[PDB]
Design an enzyme around this catalytic site. Sequence first.
Site, PDB file in Angstrom:
ATOM      1  N   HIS C 142     -62.739 -19.774  25.770  1.00 62.25           N
ATOM      2  CA  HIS C 142     -63.850 -19.410  25.155  1.00 62.25           C
ATOM      3  C   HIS C 142     -63.549 -18.241  23.951  1.00 62.25           C
ATOM      4  O   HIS C 142     -64.111 -18.200  23.116  1.00 62.25           O
ATOM      5  CB  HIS C 142     -65.184 -19.170  25.603  1.00 62.25           C
ATOM      6  N   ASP C 179     -62.236 -28.186  31.877  1.00 60.85           N
ATOM      7  CA  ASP C 179     -63.433 -27.250  32.250  1.00 60.85           C
ATOM      8  C   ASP C 179     -64.599 -27.824  31.473  1.00 60.85           C
ATOM      9  O   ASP C 179     -64.437 -28.530  30.184  1.00 60.85           O
ATOM     10  CB  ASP C 179     -63.039 -26.044  31.569  1.00 60.85           C
ATOM     11  N   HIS C 181     -67.340 -26.812  29.942  1.00 56.97           N
ATOM     12  CA  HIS C 181     -67.749 -26.394  28.813  1.00 56.97           C
ATOM     13  C   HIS C 181     -66.685 -26.401  27.654  1.00 56.97           C
ATOM     14  O   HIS C 181     -65.413 -26.835  28.004  1.00 56.97           O
ATOM     15  CB  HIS C 181     -68.079 -24.767  29.000  1.00 56.97           C
ATOM     16  N   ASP C 267     -65.782 -26.726  36.988  1.00 58.44           N
ATOM     17  CA  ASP C 267     -67.089 -26.271  36.934  1.00 58.44           C
ATOM     18  C   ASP C 267     -67.809 -27.725  36.523  1.00 58.44           C
ATOM     19  O   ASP C 267     -69.083 -27.660  36.298  1.00 58.44           O
ATOM     20  CB  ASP C 267     -67.724 -25.103  36.024  1.00 58.44           C
TER      21      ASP C 267
HETATM   22  K   LIG Z   1     -63.796 -28.603  28.020  1.00 56.88           K
HETATM   23 ZN   LIG Z   2     -66.401 -23.629  32.208  1.00 53.52          ZN
END
Ligand SMILES: [K+]
Ligand SMILES: [Zn+2]
Lengths: 374, 369, 374, 369
Positions: C142, C179, C181, C267
């Site tokens: 991120h 992941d 996100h 996650d």
């Molecule tokens: K991702």
């Molecule tokens: Zn994540």
Amino acid sequence: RRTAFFFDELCLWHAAGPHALTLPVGGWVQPPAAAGHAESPETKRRLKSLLDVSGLTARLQLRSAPPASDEDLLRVHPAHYLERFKALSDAGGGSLGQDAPIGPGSYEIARLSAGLAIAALDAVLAGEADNAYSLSRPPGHHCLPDQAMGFCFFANIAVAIEAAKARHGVERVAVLDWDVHHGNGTQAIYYRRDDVLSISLHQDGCFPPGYSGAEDIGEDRGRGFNLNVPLLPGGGHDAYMQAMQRIVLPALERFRPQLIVVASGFDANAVDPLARMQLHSDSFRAMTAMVRDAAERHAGGRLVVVHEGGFSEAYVPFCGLAVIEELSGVRSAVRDPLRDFIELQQPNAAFRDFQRQRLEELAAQFGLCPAQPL
Amino acid sequence: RRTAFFFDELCLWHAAGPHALTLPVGGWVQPPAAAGHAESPETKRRLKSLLDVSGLTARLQLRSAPPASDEDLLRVHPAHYLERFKALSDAGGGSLGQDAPIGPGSYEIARLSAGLAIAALDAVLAGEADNAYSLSRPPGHHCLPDQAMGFCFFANIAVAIEAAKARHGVERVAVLDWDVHHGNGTQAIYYRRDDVLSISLHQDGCFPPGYSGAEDIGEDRGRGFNLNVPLLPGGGHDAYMQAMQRIVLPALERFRPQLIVVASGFDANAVDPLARMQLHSDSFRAMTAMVRDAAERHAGGRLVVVHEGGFSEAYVPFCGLAVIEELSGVRSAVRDPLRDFIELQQPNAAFRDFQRQRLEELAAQFGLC
Amino acid sequence: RRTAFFFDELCLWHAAGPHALTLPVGGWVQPPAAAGHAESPETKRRLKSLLDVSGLTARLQLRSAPPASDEDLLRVHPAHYLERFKALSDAGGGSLGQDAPIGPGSYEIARLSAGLAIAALDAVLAGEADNAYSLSRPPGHHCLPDQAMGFCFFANIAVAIEAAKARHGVERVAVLDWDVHHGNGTQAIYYRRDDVLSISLHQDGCFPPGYSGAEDIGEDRGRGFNLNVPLLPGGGHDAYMQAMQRIVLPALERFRPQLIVVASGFDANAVDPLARMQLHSDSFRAMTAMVRDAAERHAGGRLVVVHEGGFSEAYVPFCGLAVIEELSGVRSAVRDPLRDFIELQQPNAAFRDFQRQRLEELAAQFGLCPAQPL
Amino acid sequence: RRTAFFFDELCLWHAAGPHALTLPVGGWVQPPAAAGHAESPETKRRLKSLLDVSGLTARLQLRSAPPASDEDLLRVHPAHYLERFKALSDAGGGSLGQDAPIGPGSYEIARLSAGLAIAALDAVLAGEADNAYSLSRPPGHHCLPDQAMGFCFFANIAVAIEAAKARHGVERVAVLDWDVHHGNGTQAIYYRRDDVLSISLHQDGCFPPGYSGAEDIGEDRGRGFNLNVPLLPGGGHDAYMQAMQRIVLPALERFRPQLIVVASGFDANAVDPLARMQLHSDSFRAMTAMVRDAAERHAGGRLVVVHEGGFSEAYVPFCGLAVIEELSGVRSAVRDPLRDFIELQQPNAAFRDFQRQRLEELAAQFGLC
Ligand SMILES: [K+]
Ligand SMILES: [Zn+2]
Ligand SMILES: [K+]
Ligand SMILES: [K+]
Ligand SMILES: [K+]
Ligand SMILES: [K+]
Ligand SMILES: [K+]
Ligand SMILES: [K+]
Ligand SMILES: [K+]
Ligand SMILES: [Zn+2]
Ligand SMILES: [Zn+2]
Ligand SMILES: [Zn+2]
């Protein structure tokens, strides 16, 4: 009796950054996987919970209070200390002093803790209750006017006393500090004052480290109005009873308090990680009975107990319960499951006699006459 | 020096039912939000973590071991004790004795703990290492042959010694137990034996509660081969140094051990909730140096340290690290952050002198003056 | 196979100030009595412990690495970001960005996390292992060049790739980010680049909140070299397999990677608090098998898996174990105790068909031909 | 409005053996360092804390209640079930059923939990309050008459309703169960009854795993008086609003309840580990407003909300607070910090339309179109 219990749930929400016991995390100190910072709310929360399931909370006058005003705080602390604390609190937290870590909103919670102490003294002086217990977190007795330390950020008891003098005109206040560490903040603030008698029972050299302080009896106007009783590490029930009988009660007799305030830490308990003393819940009960009796004889019963240290989550609740039972005169059904075990662990006769002789000599050094209560 | 470090990750997975410190949850003891049982794995886990982050792990001989066999366990415990233990472990857990709670799979983990102590003694006796450290959880020194207690479920040291005698024919073993509580299990097992000198330094009356034990020096064949040094609560560095110099080292000098085993609890440390003593990491360092010196003078350097108690998550790791540094002769970059603080908190001159006088009187009672 | 496992115990010591899950403590968010900050080391520690008791750690090439140099960090981050981070880290911790809280020594630990990613790519490019897994904490995907966010403080994978290009001259790197996100940092850094194909499978609108990003395929030189697959919340095994088959594998076929890097968050697992997807450990195993096969066909087997998110302490370890079993070709005795249960919870046929149709349409929107592997 | 809040501190003291989330510790599941069991007291403790710090507690009628009597419990559970439960509770704890672990004293605490639900229904039926909230832990809605499951040990709502019928003669009760899991216990008990309309909103196939249940509308006398609304995993505010408007409110309109009971789990919240739904505190606020409106139109305002599941320590307190604000008609200063974040994460237009179409088809199947 009518016992006021000053409590606010928000005091249980104060929490500094990461600490393994008292050590700030970082360098060689690994982050705790479970626990966190030593000045944890859990001990105080488990006290409150136990007071509730025991039925004792229902027999108390349960109260909150407004937070301490800047005006109340500025009697002891400078505006630049307030602004700094506030700035660090609004920034998310950080280090304010010597073992004085804070989190976000710590300023507000510190103000509320001081406010509870202020209100407790006020209620007792106004005749709204016979006595009171303030579950103040964070604690106060180490905090100097311009220096946070030992997880204390405002000098709670000093702030409450200064406010009580301005509101009520009280002339003689005795502060008995049985937290296991030295009440250095209270000592320093009132060191040259005869309107406040400050007595500390503490483990010799524990905190501040290396400080015993028997010879530090106050100065000039305050000479004889500060008394330090440095008990030998490893002492328990008998050591504290002898201290109460040979030093504390005679000092109180001579002083004639109009109000007695107890800085009640429970870290002298036999399983505390932050000291090496061996008290059980009945030790705290007996100390409270003696000070309640003293308050009844001199001060029209006016007694306020302010919560200070205590870092055993398992055992502090039993000790706090015993104090509140003694203030209120209500005996709950709770039986202390460690009491019998702690009895067997007490110093032997030889060690008890060694400590007793040291206390006899200290009483004589202070010029305290061994009369009884009247 | 070549230091063997015996460890198994699975020892860190043993976990009792809910407890607040050492109090079983139930009645007036509220379930903890965070902590849980006194004999938590986190103290032993944090020592191993600190050993890895300090780099000391790279300079040790890392070893593991099979679980103890029934044969090894049966040299000290009866078959029915093993059965009862295993049934309760299989049933999800419960209370196997007084202050002796177990969880599911606790039997298998206790066997692994005992096996590590067996393997560590074997390694040193065979010359695979000069000395060894066993991170044995759960601990052993309170366990009697048919009674678990004080969070001990097998008598790890006893089982290891009995195995070592069967395997190597070792004739004289000294056990120095500096866990802050009394090594009642070891004392009972070897009470009438002269082939095993059992010494316990402990806080007077701590655990078992009320027991001091200076008078209990062994019986018949073992008379003189058990020594209890009950230290006053509140003592720290000087009390332990004086106990070592006046009692332990002279006793070892007389016995001439072929092997020294230390029941190394770290619960004499200054911030432990389960005792009232004031040791720092350098006190443990110095006790290790002294016993290592004894081992070099009589035992060809053959010393094994078996981890026992210690319930300060924050501080036990530094005390354990100090011991392993001293065993290996390698000093890491880790600095004990409480060291200077604890120095300042030590007993004053008068209290030190009081304790010193008692130890002088005790050494004369033992005939070591 | 020879699988390198890049791990350092010190990465498990990073810990920010007080947070209830992801919410910073303060205001209305009470301090957690037990847990603490969402980006906890416990998940990664329990993975390591499970790898150890399973016997898998003994079958891996266990390695550490030096921390990332300033030189390595400065390829993507500006010196003033480094100095700020360092300053806040030395001050005791605090807030560095948008959901980017740090503690004391976080700077050093962040550097070590990036260093592990750098070393993992290096080892695989040097031929020291067939593939690798880096247990990097804190995570990276991120983090933008000048902005920490989502608990990422350095752009770990970007840093490692830039270092790999400077050391080895690698021309084509595919980054598959599973992941749950959106890999916004990787996307932004490589958005106008054709030497790095960035693919993100994520829950539509989860984090950053509201971002789907299907139309964001890269720009100019990078057009077609960024692919976002926003999966509908509630999807599980079939949704990810269909995404892998219809989008990921065809994109990889066309790109011809010389090295594949997986930003492996866990996650998307069915019990994660920070997303709403329904993957089990065999989902992760199957995704790893497909990407390992792709790495074997195009990149001489050169595959690096870098640990990113995952906040279920109970279940992340089983998912991580499955990935490492698949990389190494060693099957442990560990059986996933939630696998059968999660199977029954999967989307129904109607929902699975709805998701499948959306993926068919997305594949067509991207201009991806449905060929098979060769 | 006069809102009664039924609570007992001792409900927050129930604690199972060691669990990682919902997995019993044992085999390959390592003991947690920190957390412990899924059905932790900390979620319910944090709601009560937030209620006190928000000041809302001062505006509620705070009440407690005696534990449920055997007489009350025996209206739904057999004597042998109580015996077995109490024996296991006395023995230190264990597993009473499937995903149903208990600790020491869990029997007494389960009785207290059930008593609070009984007392809350009684208070509202007697006119002591307009409505009520019961902080009943452990929960009830999965518990069958002779089988504990899903951390439920007595069928709290069923026991409360049976007690209310015996005490007050109430003829029509609606139970709306917005816990994210299927209210299997309530459904089974009242499946062939028309005096109790049971409605469950739940994540399709979540728990019990694989169960959707739209087809199960009750039998014989109860045919039409059970309604399952299995929502697609991943849905949030709109899915629940559409379920309420197209199914729940029309069903309640037809049944004309004299009392409404809500089995209020908060595990449909957007950060819960035990489901995949995306509700925020305002979704719970709006569902409460809607059911309160139903209660005012048919039931003289008589509404009781019984706390069920919810396993996000961080977020459940804000959802619970929203419900109590809506019950009492009092708005605190507390602002939900995740609210705007969760709004942004909601299903897109296409997914919302897909779910809407399914709910339209389901409402027509139930004959509510
Ligand atoms: K991702
Ligand atoms: Zn994540
Ligand atoms: K004191
Ligand atoms: K004074
Ligand atoms: K000992
Ligand atoms: K002996
Ligand atoms: K790109
Ligand atoms: K439901
Ligand atoms: K029905
Ligand atoms: Zn203290
Ligand atoms: Zn011990
Ligand atoms: Zn539920």
